[PDB]
Amino acid sequence: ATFEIVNRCSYTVWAAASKGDAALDAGGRQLNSGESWTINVEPGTNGGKIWARTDCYFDDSGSGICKTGDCGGLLRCKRFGRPPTTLAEFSLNQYGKDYIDISNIKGFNVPMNFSPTTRGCRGVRCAADIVGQCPAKLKAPGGGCNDACTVFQTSEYCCTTGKCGPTEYSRFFKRLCPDAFSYVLDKPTTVTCPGSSNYRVTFCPT
Numbered sequence: 001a002t003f004e005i006v007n008r009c010s011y012t013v014w015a016a017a018s019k020g021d022a023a024l025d026a027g028g029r030q031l032n033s034g035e036s037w038t039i040n041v042e043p044g045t046n047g048g049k050i051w052a053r054t055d056c057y058f059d060d061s062g063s064g065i066c067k068t069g070d071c072g073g074l075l076r077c078k079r080f081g082r083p084p085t086t087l088a089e090f091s092l093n094q095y096g097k098d099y100i101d102i103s104n105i106k107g108f109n110v111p112m113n114f115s116p117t118t119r120g121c122r123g124v125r126c127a128a129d130i131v132g133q134c135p136a137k138l139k140a141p142g143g144g145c146n147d148a149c150t151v152f153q154t155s156e157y158c159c160t161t162g163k164c165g166p167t168e169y170s171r172f173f174k175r176l177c178p179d180a181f182s183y184v185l186d187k188p189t190t191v192t193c194p195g196s197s198n199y200r201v202t203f204c205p206t
Contacts, residue, residue, distance in 0.1 A: 001042075003040075014028055
């Protein structure tokens, strides 16, 4: 499957793509404002994610740091990124269908649209100014808007027991972005697409 990752932000981002235990494609690339990077993701990939990283520095070997979404200091991510990270999430060719969503469960750094480029389903978007509107206690000093689990490490925010409800913090994310997951047990906003669809992830769509 192809995923075109487009940076419409006015700032550089370092795109990342992983399934948690491996890179997808090269795993990461710098995208200056306006740049696009097309990756190939193997059919059947379960639990893939794409995200933006901000304020990164990498040496010539591809090792360094980012302020949001850092994946173990690598340009080419093999693992998931450090919150806060707006997440484009997907599982492909799962009993003949693909499943896509956006999640704020690991916080929000950069606004995102995640849409099919092929027929048969709709896209999802979280493009409100979550960083600007972020509750004081969730603001990450390193940049972005943390989720409450990251900040407070409680069973309730982290849904550790598989019993949790919405919270004042999750409701903030949900108010700003109704079509993204705001906590683990949120009413799903996952879209079913034809198996083997192709996609575009756009940072700063609006």
